[PDB]
Paper text:
To strengthen this hypothesis, four mutations were inserted at position 76: D76A, D76E, D76H, and D76K. While D76K resulted too unstable to be purified, the other three variants were structurally and biophysically characterized. The crystal structures of D76A, D76E, and D76H were determined to high resolution. The side chain of Arg97 presents different conformations, and the strength of its interactions with the EF loop and to Trp95 varies in different mutants; residue Met99 interacts with Ser11 or with Arg12. Such observations suggest a role for residue 76 in determining the interactions within the EF loop and with β2m C-terminal region.
A recent case of systemic amyloidosis involves the highly unstable D76N mutation of beta-2 microglobulin (β2m). Indeed, the 76 position is located in a solvent exposed loop between β-strands E and F. A detailed analysis of the interaction energies of the ensembles reveals that D76 is at the center of a network of stabilizing electrostatic interactions that are lost in the D76N mutant.
Author numbering: 0 to 99
Amino acid sequence: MIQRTPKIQVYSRHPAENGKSNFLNCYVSGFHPSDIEVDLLKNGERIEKVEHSDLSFSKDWSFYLLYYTEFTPTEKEEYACRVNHVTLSQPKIVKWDRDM
């Protein structure tokens, strides 16, 4: 058996074909086993509609998840990604740095 803690990066992107739109991304990488729970949060509350969830693997024991959706942030709002995984004794919350 092998288990590996996910790395978690939270960042924003504008698709080049539609630069006015903005997407909040949580990239959860290199984890095993594949069982996992991932949410985007706004002011600590789960965002129910997340329109993209793309899972892949490299080696049979390394998984990658890009979890992202359109958003329109204001400076007073806090966004984050919350991950639960067997390697994590408590949920890991990674805040979105608004300059990223």
